[PDB]
C-alpha cells in the first residue's frame, strides 16, 4: 500500500506510512522500555 | 508536462486539474485567498475608490500581501445617450427610441411557434448592413409616430467607452473584494494590525463599511474546539487504563511510553516526503492504539 | 530520541487534501472578457486539435 | 412624562413601524419609558408611587 | 392571522400557509403584493434605537434614508436577527402638482401624462455588436435623477408643430410621503429609529451584544452630528435576574455552611453539601439541553427552592455519619463501618427523593398557555430532584 | 456548502440592467429568508445568478423550501417575459455522465 | 378621483440601491373640502370642460 | 396511498393542445420528484388532471 500506485491510493499511503514507520519502534518499546521502567517501579 | 508544453496560444493561461475538483471549485462561490477585505457601499464608484486606497494601505504593513483590487473592469461599451429635448422635438418619448434600440438592433423575441411538443422562438430585427458599427447606428433610420423620416443621431449621441464585465453584489449591496495572501504562516495577528492601519490612515465615506473574512475565520474556531476534546479523550482513556490495572503507575507509564511509538511512526514521513494532515493524524492515532495494546499485554504478563 | 524527533516536525509541510489523480483531466485556460462567437469556436477547435 | 424626576428617557411612537408585527393605527400611541437606577430615584418612591 | 392548533411546528405552519399564498398573488391588484410576517413572536422586539441629530444640518428625510438604506442592511447581516424595522422619519418623494388650467388649455388627459412618465425612467440595451475580433456591449441611459430631467418630458407633440413639455403643464418638486407612523424622542423633537426583532427561540444576549458591537464599529462612518441613542434592551433585565439568582444561591450556600458549622461544632462536613448541590443542577440542565426547553426567568427562579429541598438528604447523611463516627469513638475497615452507617439510611432517603421527584407529574399534566409557561419550572425541578437522588446515592 | 441557486435568463441586456432589474429585487427579497448565512449575486451579460448560502447542518430540502418561500413574491416584480427558476437538487458532484 | 385627489404612485426613481416613489396629484386648493370636490375640474375624453 | 392532485385549466383548447402544452410537461416533470411511484394524467377539452 505504501509502494503502490492505483486509484485513490494517495490517501491510503498517507494513512499507512505512520504505522509502517512506527512498527519498528513499538516492538522495541514494549520489549525494552516497559520491563526496564517496571523494574524501576519502587 | 507534455500537455502544457504542447498547447501554447497567446492570451491563455493553462491549468490542468481534475474534473470533479474543477466542478466543486466552480460551484464554490466563496473567497479563495487567505484574507479578504469586503468594502460595501451604496454605489460602485465610492467603494472602488476606497479599495484603490486600501490596496496600498494593506500592501505597506509587514508581510507579503499581493493586494489586488479586482479584475472586473474589462467591458467595452457603445453608449447611445438619448437626449430628451431632441427626442421631444420629433414627438418620441424615451421608450419610443428604446423600442427601436431593442427591436431593430437588439432583436428580442416576439413569439414562439409550436410544432407539437417543441417551441421555436421568433426574432424581429433589421438587416446586418444597418447595425454593423457605431457609424451605422448613427444613421439608423427611424420612423416617428407622425410618420417622419429621421436618423438615430438626431435624438441621441453614440459614444464608445469601457466598463465592467460582471457585477458582484454581497447582501444586496455593491461590494468590492480585496485579496491579501501569504503562505506557510498563520494569519492570526496580521488581521488586527491591518484593521488598525485601515481605521487610522483611511477615512470612510458616508454610507460605506469595511469587513474582514477568509479561511482563518474558521481555523481559529476549529483548532479551538480540538483543544477542548484532546484532553477529554486522554481523560476517558486514563480512567480506562486505571480500571485495567487498578493502579496509576501502569497507566502513567503507558501514556508516557506511547510517545516513543509516535516518534518511530513520525520519523518515516520525512524520509517518504509526505506532509502531515488529518489522514496522518488517524494513522498516528491507530499506531498509538496498537502501541498501547502492546504495552498493556506486556505489562499483564 | 523523543527529543530529537522535533527536527522533522517543523521541517515537515502541511496540506489540506492530497490531490487525488483521476482517470481523466480538465484543461481550463484563464483568458480575458472580450471574445466573439466565431473566435471562441476557432480557439476551441485549435486547442482541442492541439 | 419627561417631567417626572425618575424617568431618564422616553421614546414615543404613534402608528406602525413598517413591520407585519405592528398594526397600530395613527391614533394609538405607545411610549417606552426608561427609569433611573433604583439607587437614584428618591427616598422611598416605590414603583407603585412612580406609576 | 392564520392561527393553527397547539403543538405545531412553526416552519411547517409557514410552509402550509405559503402553499396557498402563490394562488392569490395573481388575483390581487397590480401594484400590491402580500408578504409573510417575520419569524418572531411577540417577544421578538429586543433592541430599539433612534437616530438623533445634534445640529440643524440633517432633516428627517436624510435620517430616514440613512436608516433604510444603510443601517437596515448593515444590521440584518447578524445571524440570528429576524428583521430590523424602521420607524419615524420622512420618506422623500418626487411630487408632480398638475394644474387643471393648463390641462384644459393644452387639452391633455392624465392617462397620457402617466404614459409619458412611465416611458422615461428605464434603460434599454441591444445585443452586443460584432467589432473587429472583440465584443463591445451597449448600454443606454434614460433614468431620472434630477428635476431638470422631469421638466423635459414631452406629453404631446404635433408634426411640424411645437412639443408640449411637462414643465409647461405641471410643477415638479421634492416632498414628504403620507406618514403612517411617527416616532419621537423626549420633548426636544422628532427622530427616526429602528427596532430589532429576534428569531423564534434564540439567545437574546448574544444577538444584543453583536448588534451593539456592530453599531459601535459603524458609528465611525456616520455623518457629522448624527448619534444613535438606544431606548430599550432586554440584556439589562436578564443580567439583573441572573445576578439576583446568583446572589441568592450564594447566600443559601453561606447559610448552609454557617448552620453546619454551628450545629456540628466547627466541622467542614458542610463541604459535602456545597459540592453535591451544584452537580444536581448540572444534571438537570444537561437533561434540559437534551430536550431544548429554553430557560426562562421562572425556570431560573425555581432552583433556589430546589437546592433548599435537596439539602435535606445531604444534611441527614452528614448528621448520621457524624453520630455513628462519634459512637464508634467510645469503643481501612473503619470506613467500611461508616459505609454501613451511610447505607442504613441510604434507601429511605433515595425513596423519599424518588417520591418527591415523581410528585410533579401533575404539573406536566396541564397544557396550553399555562402549561407552556409553567412547564420548564416543573421540568427543571423534577430533573434536579432526580439528580439529587442519584448523588445522595453516590 | 448547503446553498441554493436561482438563475434568471435575460437575452440581450448589459450587466447593470440585469443587476438593477432582475438581480436587485431577487437579492433584496432573499436577504430576509430564514436561516440564510449570506446572499451573493452575480450579474453577467444577459444572465443573473443568486446564491443563497445557509449555515452548516441544515436540511437541503428545508433550505430549498425556505428559499422558495420568498421566490413567489418576486415573480410579480420581474419583467414580463423573464422568470426566475430554482437550481437543481444536485451539488458540484452532480455531473456524472456526458455524451455527444 | 384616485389620481388627481388621491395621489397614487406612478413610478419609482432609482438612485443606486434606493427607490423613491413618484406622486402625481392636483394642488391643495382644489382638494381642500367637499365644496372644493364639488367643483373639481374634469376634462372629458372629447376635451370638454366640466 | 399518498396521492397529490394537480388540476390545470386551459379555457377552450382541444385535448391535444392542452396535452402537449400542459399535461405532457407536468407529467414529465413530476416523474423526477423524490419518491414518486407513478404519475398518471388525463387532459380533457378544458381541464387537465395529474
Look at E73 and B160 and tell me if their CB atoms are within 8 Å.
no
Look at B74 and C33 and tell me if their CB atoms are within 8 Å.
yes
DSSP state of G29: G
Write the DSSP assignment of chain H as a string of letters: ------EEE-TT--HHHHIIIIIHHHHHHGGGSTT------EE-SSEEE-
And the C-alpha cell for B84?
A: 430628451
Rounded to whole angstroms, the Cα distance separating B228 from B244 reads 26
Q: Does an H or E element contain B3, and which?
A: helix B2-6
Which segments of chain B does DSSP mark as H helices, in order?
2-6, 19-27, 44-59, 84-88, 94-100, 134-137, 190-201, 216-245, 248-272, 278-300
Interface H:B, ≥3 CB–CB pairs < 8 Å: yes
Does residue E302 sit in helix, strand or coil? helix
Number of Cβ within 10 Å of residue G27's Cβ equals 13
Q: What is the dihedral of CA E52, E53, E59, E65, to 10 degrees?
A: -50
Task: Measure CA E303 to chain center.
Answer: 26
Rounded to whole angstroms, the Cα distance separating E334 from B287 reads 46
Number of Cβ within 10 Å of residue E303's Cβ equals 24
Give the phi and the psi of residue D38 in degrees, each rounded to 5.
-60, -20
Q: Which of H17, H12, H21 is nearest to H46 (CA)?
A: H12
| Residue whose C-alpha cell is 487525488 | C20
C44 in E contact zone (CB under 8 Å): no
Look at C12 and B263 and tell me if their CB atoms are within 8 Å.
no
Give the phi and the psi of residue B242 in degrees, each rounded to 5.
-55, -50
- Partners of residue B205 in chain G, C-beta under 8 Å: none
- Partners of residue B164 in chain F, C-beta under 8 Å: 15-16
- Partners of residue B219 in chain C, C-beta under 8 Å: none
> Would you put residue B256 in left (φ > 0), alpha (ψ -120 to 50) or beta?
alpha
Task: Measure CA B196 to chain center.
Answer: 25
Closest-CA residue in chain C for B19? Answer: C26
Neighbours, chain F (3 or more CB pairs < 8 A): B, E
Q: Which candidate from G15, G17, G24 shows the least CB-CB separation from E98?
A: G24
Q: Does an H or E element contain B61, and which?
A: none
Rounded to whole angstroms, the Cα distance separating F5 from F49 reads 7
Rounded to whole angstroms, the Cα distance separating B290 from B297 reads 11
Closest-CA residue in chain D for E52? Answer: D11
- Find the chain F residues whose C-beta atoms sit closer than 8 A to any C-beta of E: 11-14, 16-17, 31-32, 34, 37-38, 45, 55, 62, 65-66, 69-70, 72-73, 75-77
For B189-200, the three-class secondary structure string (H helix, E strand, C coil) is CHHHHHHHHHHH
Rounded to whole angstroms, the Cα distance separating F73 from F78 reads 10
Task: Measure CA E274 to chain center.
Answer: 37
Rounded to whole angstroms, the Cα distance separating G38 from E63 reads 40
Rounded to whole angstroms, the Cα distance separating A22 from B260 reads 9
Q: Does an H or E element contain D33, and which?
A: strand D29-35
The sheet that has F85-86: what strands, in order across it? B167-170, F36-43, F47-54, F3-9, F85-86
Q: Which candidate from C12, C20, C47 shows the least CB-CB separation from B7?
A: C47
- Find the chain F residues whose C-beta atoms sit closer than 8 A to any C-beta of B: 1, 3, 11-12, 14-16, 19, 23-24, 27-28, 31, 38-45, 51, 53, 81, 91-95
> Strand H42-43 relative to strand B149-150: parallel, antiparallel, unpaired?
unpaired
Resolution in A: 3.0
Q: Which candidate from B266, B291, B299 shows the least CB-CB separation from A26?
A: B291
Give the phi and the psi of residue F18 in degrees, each rounded to 5.
-65, -15
B116 in H contact zone (CB under 8 Å): yes
Q: Which residues pair with B160 in a beta bridge?
A: B78
D19 touches E38 (CB < 8 A): yes
D2 touches D33 (CB < 8 A): no
Interface B:A, ≥3 CB–CB pairs < 8 Å: yes
A21 touches B286 (CB < 8 A): no
DSSP state of A30: I
Q: Which of C44, A12, C18, C43 is nearest to B18 (CA)?
A: C18
Number of Cβ within 10 Å of residue B140's Cβ equals 21
- Residue E251, C-beta contacts closer than 8 angstroms, at least 6 positions apart: none
Closest-CA residue in chain E for G46? Answer: E107
Look at A17 and B267 and tell me if their CB atoms are within 8 Å.
no
Measured CA angle at E55 (ends E50, E58), to 5 deg: 70
Rounded to whole angstroms, the Cα distance separating B301 from B289 reads 19
> Strand E92-98 relative to strand G19-25: parallel, antiparallel, unpaired?
parallel
DSSP state of B229: H
Burial of E323 (0-12, 13-18, 19+ CB in 10 A): exposed
Burial of H24 (0-12, 13-18, 19+ CB in 10 A): middle
And the C-alpha cell for B37?
A: 477585505
B201 in E contact zone (CB under 8 Å): no
Give the minimum alpha-carbon distance from A39 to chain B in angstroms, rounded to a whole number: 11
And the C-alpha cell for E338?
A: 461508616
Give the minimum alpha-carbon distance from F37 to chain B in angstroms, rounded to a whole number: 10
Look at C35 and E130 and tell me if their CB atoms are within 8 Å.
no
Rounded to whole angstroms, the Cα distance separating E390 from E204 reads 34
B151 touches B138 (CB < 8 A): yes
Helix axes B248-272, B216-245, angle to 10 degrees: 140
Q: Which of A32, A15, A35 is nearest to B260 (CA)?
A: A32
Which segments of F1-100 does DSSP mark as H helices, in order?
15-18, 24-30, 60-69, 72-75
Helix axes E235-263, E297-328, angle to 10 degrees: 10
- Partners of residue E144 in chain G, C-beta under 8 Å: 13
Q: Which candidate from F16, F34, F55 shows the least CB-CB separation from E39?
A: F34
Task: Measure CA E382 to chain center.
Answer: 29
Alpha carbons within 13 angstroms on the beta-carbon side of residue A40 total 7
Rounded to whole angstroms, the Cα distance separating B261 from B258 reads 5
Which segments of E152-269 does DSSP mark as H helices, in order?
204-218, 235-263
C19 in A contact zone (CB under 8 Å): yes
And the C-alpha cell for E163?
A: 412639443
Look at B29 and F42 and tell me if their CB atoms are within 8 Å.
yes
Give E251-260's long-range contacts (Cβ < 8 A, gap of 24+): E252/E304, E252/E307, E252/E308, E253/E277, E256/E311, E260/E315, E260/E318
And the C-alpha cell for D15?
A: 402608528
Give the phi and the psi of residue E386 in degrees, each rounded to 5.
-65, -45
Number of Cβ within 10 Å of residue E341's Cβ equals 19
And the C-alpha cell for B190?
A: 496580521
Interface mutation vs chain B, best among A3, A12, A30, A33, most B CBs within 10 Å: A30
- Partners of residue B11 in chain C, C-beta under 8 Å: 31-32
Look at B261 and A22 and tell me if their CB atoms are within 8 Å.
yes
Q: Does an H or E element contain B78, and which?
A: strand B75-82
Q: Spell out a b/e string for B248-273, using b for 16 or more CB atoms within 10 Å of the CB, else e.
A: eebbebbbebbebbbbbbbbbbeeee
Q: Which candidate from E40, E184, E231 shows the least CB-CB separation from D21?
A: E40
Q: Which candidate from B260, B277, B298 shows the least CB-CB separation from A25?
A: B260
- Find the chain E residues whose C-beta atoms sit closer than 8 A to any C-beta of D: 35-38, 40, 42, 44-45, 48, 50, 83, 85-88, 179-187, 193, 195, 197, 229, 231-232
Let me know how long chain F is.
Answer: 100
A4 touches A14 (CB < 8 A): no
E15 in F contact zone (CB under 8 Å): yes
Number of Cβ within 10 Å of residue E391's Cβ equals 19
Number of Cβ within 10 Å of residue B104's Cβ equals 20
Look at G3 and E94 and tell me if their CB atoms are within 8 Å.
no
- Find the chain B residues whose C-beta atoms sit closer than 8 A to any C-beta of A: 249, 253, 257, 260-269, 272, 274, 277, 279-280, 282-284, 286-287, 290-291, 294-295, 298-299
A7 touches B271 (CB < 8 A): no
Amino acid at each position: 500500500i505504501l509502494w503502490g500506485t492505483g486509484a485513490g491510493s494517495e490517501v491510503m499511503s498517507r494513512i499507512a506510512a505512520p504505522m509502517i514507520g512506527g512498527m519498528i519502534t513499538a516492538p522495541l518499546l514494549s520489549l525494552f522500555i516497559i520491563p526496564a521502567a517496571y523494574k524501576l517501579m519502587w | 508536462e507534455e500537455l502544457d508544453n504542447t498547447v501554447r496560444l497567446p492570451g491563455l493561461a493553462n491549468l490542468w486539474v481534475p474534473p470533479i475538483r474543477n466542478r466543486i471549485d466552480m460551484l464554490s462561490t466563496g473567497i479563495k485567498s487567505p484574507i479578504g477585505i469586503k468594502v460595501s457601499g451604496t454605489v460602485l464608484a465610492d467603494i472602488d475608490a476606497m479599495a484603490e486606497q486600501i490596496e496600498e494601505v494593506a500592501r505597506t504593513v509587514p508581510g507579503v500581501a499581493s493586494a489586488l483590487a479586482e479584475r472586473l473592469e474589462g467591458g467595452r461599451y457603445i453608449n447611445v445617450e438619448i437626449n430628451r429635448e431632441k427626442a421631444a422635438r420629433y414627438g418620441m418619448t424615451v421608450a419610443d427610441v428604446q423600442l427601436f434600440v431593442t427591436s431593430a438592433v437588439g432583436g428580442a423575441m416576439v413569439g414562439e411557434t409550436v410544432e407539437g411538443i417543441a417551441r421555436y422562438p421568433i426574432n424581429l430585427r433589421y438587416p446586418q448592413s444597418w447595425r454593423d458599427s457605431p457609424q451605422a447606428l448613427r444613421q439608423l433610420p427611424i420612423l416617428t409616430p407622425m410618420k417622419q423620416q429621421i436618423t438615430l443621431a438626431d435624438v441621441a449621441d453614440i459614444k464608445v467607452s469601457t466598463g465592467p464585465s460582471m457585477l458582484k453584489t454581497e447582501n444586496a449591496r455593491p461590494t468590492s473584494w480585496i485579496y491579501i495572501d501569504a503562505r506557510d504562516r498563520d494569519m492570526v495577528s496580521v488581521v488586527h494590525d491591518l484593521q488598525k492601519a485601515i481605521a487610522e490612515k483611511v477615512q470612510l465615506k458616508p454610507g460605506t463599511s469595511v469587513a474582514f473574512s477568509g479561511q482563518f475565520e474558521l481555523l481559529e474556531r476549529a483548532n479551538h474546539k480540538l483543544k477542548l476534546m484532546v484532553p477529554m479523550t486522554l481523560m476517558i482513556i486514563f480512567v480506562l487504563l486505571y480500571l485495567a490495572f487498578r493502579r496509576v503507575g501502569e497507566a502513567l507509564l503507558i501514556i508516557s511510553s506511547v510517545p516513543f511509538a509516535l516518534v518511530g511512526g513520525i520519523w518515516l514521513l520525512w524520509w517518504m516526503g509526505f506532509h502531515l494532515s488529518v489522514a496522518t493524524g488517524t494513522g498516528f492515532i491507530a499506531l498509538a492504539g496498537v502501541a498501547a495494546e502492546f504495552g498493556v499485554v506486556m505489562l499483564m504478563y | 530520541s523523543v527529543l530529537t524527533v522535533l527536527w522533522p516536525l517543523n521541517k515537515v509541510g502541511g496540506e489540506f487534501l492530497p490531490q487525488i489523480n483521476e482517470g481523466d483531466l480538465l484543461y481550463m485556460p484563464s483568458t480575458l472578457p472580450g471574445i466573439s462567437a466565431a473566435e471562441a469556436a476557432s480557439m476551441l477547435q485549435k486547442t482541442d486539435k492541439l | 412624562i419627561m417631567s417626572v424626576p425618575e424617568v431618564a428617557r422616553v421614546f414615543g411612537k404613534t402608528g406602525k413601524a413598517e413591520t407585519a408585527t405592528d398594526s397600530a393605527p395613527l391614533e394609538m400611541v405607545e411610549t417606552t419609558i426608561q427609569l433611573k437606577p433604583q439607587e437614584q430615584w428618591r427616598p422611598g418612591m416605590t414603583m407603585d408611587k412612580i406609576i | 392571522y392564520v392561527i393553527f392548533e397547539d403543538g405545531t411546528d412553526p416552519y411547517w405552519a409557514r410552509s402550509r400557509v405559503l402553499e396557498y399564498l402563490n394562488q392569490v398573488q395573481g388575483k390581487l391588484p397590480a401594484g400590491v403584493s402580500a408578504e409573510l410576517g417575520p419569524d418572531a413572536t411577540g417577544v421578538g422586539w429586543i433592541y430599539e434605537y433612534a437616530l438623533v441629530d445634534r445640529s440643524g444640518k440633517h432633516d428627517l428625510a436624510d435620517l430616514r434614508s440613512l436608516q433604510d438604506w444603510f443601517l437596515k442592511y448593515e444590521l440584518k447581516t447578524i445571524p440570528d436577527v429576524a428583521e430590523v424595522a424602521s420607524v419615524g422619519g420622512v420618506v422623500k418623494e418626487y411630487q408632480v402638482v398638475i394644474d387643471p388650467q393648463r390641462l384644459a388649455q393644452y387639452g391633455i388627459s392624465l392617462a397620457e401624462v402617466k404614459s409619458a412618465l412611465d416611458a422615461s425612467n428605464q434603460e434599454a440595451g441591444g445585443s452586443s455588436i460584432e467589432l473587429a475580433e472583440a465584443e463591445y456591449m451597449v448600454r443606454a441611459s434614460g433614468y431620472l435623477q434630477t428635476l431638470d430631467d422631469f421638466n423635459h418630458i414631452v406629453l404631446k407633440a404635433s408634426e411640424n408643430g411645437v412639443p408640449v413639455y411637462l414643465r409647461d403643464v405641471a410643477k415638479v418638486q421634492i416632498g414628504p410621503e403620507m406618514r403612517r407612523g411617527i416616532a419621537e424622542l423626549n420633548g426636544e423633537g422628532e427622530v427616526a429609529g429602528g427596532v430589532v426583532i429576534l428569531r423564534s427561540g434564540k439567545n437574546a444576549r448574544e444577538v444584543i451584544a453583536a448588534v451593539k458591537d456592530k453599531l459601535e464599529t459603524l458609528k465611525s462612518s456616520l455623518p457629522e452630528g448624527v448619534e444613535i441613542v438606544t431606548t430599550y434592551d432586554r440584556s439589562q433585565l436578564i443580567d439583573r435576574a441572573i445576578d439576583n439568582l446568583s446572589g441568592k444561591l450564594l447566600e443559601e450556600f453561606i447559610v448552609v455552611a454557617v448552620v453546619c458549622a454551628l450545629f456540628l461544632w466547627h466541622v467542614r462536613s458542610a463541604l459535602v453539601a456545597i459540592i453535591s448541590l451544584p452537580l444536581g443542577l448540572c444534571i438537570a440542565f444537561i437533561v434540559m439541553h437534551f430536550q431544548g426547553l429554553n430557560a426562562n426567568i421562572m425556570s431560573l427562579g425555581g432552583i433556589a427552592i430546589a437546592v433548599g429541598a435537596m439539602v435535606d438528604a445531604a444534611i441527614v447523611m452528614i448528621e448520621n455519619a457524624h453520630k455513628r463516627l462519634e459512637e464508634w469513638q467510645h469503643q481501612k475497615t473503619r470506613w467500611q463501618v461508616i459505609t454501613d452507617a451511610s447505607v442504613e439510611v441510604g434507601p429511605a432517603l433515595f425513596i423519599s427523593l424518588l417520591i418527591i421527584t415523581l410528585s410533579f407529574i401533575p404539573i406536566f399534566t396541564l397544557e396550553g398557555q399555562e402549561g407552556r409557561l409553567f412547564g420548564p419550572l416543573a421540568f427543571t425541578k423534577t430533573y434536579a430532584m432526580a439528580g439529587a437522588a442519584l448523588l445522595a446515592i453516590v | 456548502d448547503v446553498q441554493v441557486i436561482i438563475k434568471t435568463s435575460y437575452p440581450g441586456q448589459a450587466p447593470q440592467i440585469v443587476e438593477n432589474q432582475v438581480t436587485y429585487p431577487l437579492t433584496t427579497t432573499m436577504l430576509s429568508v430564514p436561516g440564510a448565512k449570506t446572499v451573493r449575486g452575480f450579474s453577467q451579460f444577459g444572465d443573473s445568478y443568486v446564491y443563497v448560502i445557509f449555515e452548516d447542518g441544515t436540511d437541503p430540502y428545508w433550505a430549498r423550501s425556505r428559499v422558495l418561500e420568498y421566490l413567489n413574491q418576486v415573480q410579480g416584480k420581474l419583467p414580463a417575459g423573464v422568470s426566475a427558476e430554482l437550481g437543481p437538487d444536485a451539488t458540484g458532484v452532480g455531473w456524472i455522465y456526458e455524451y455527444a
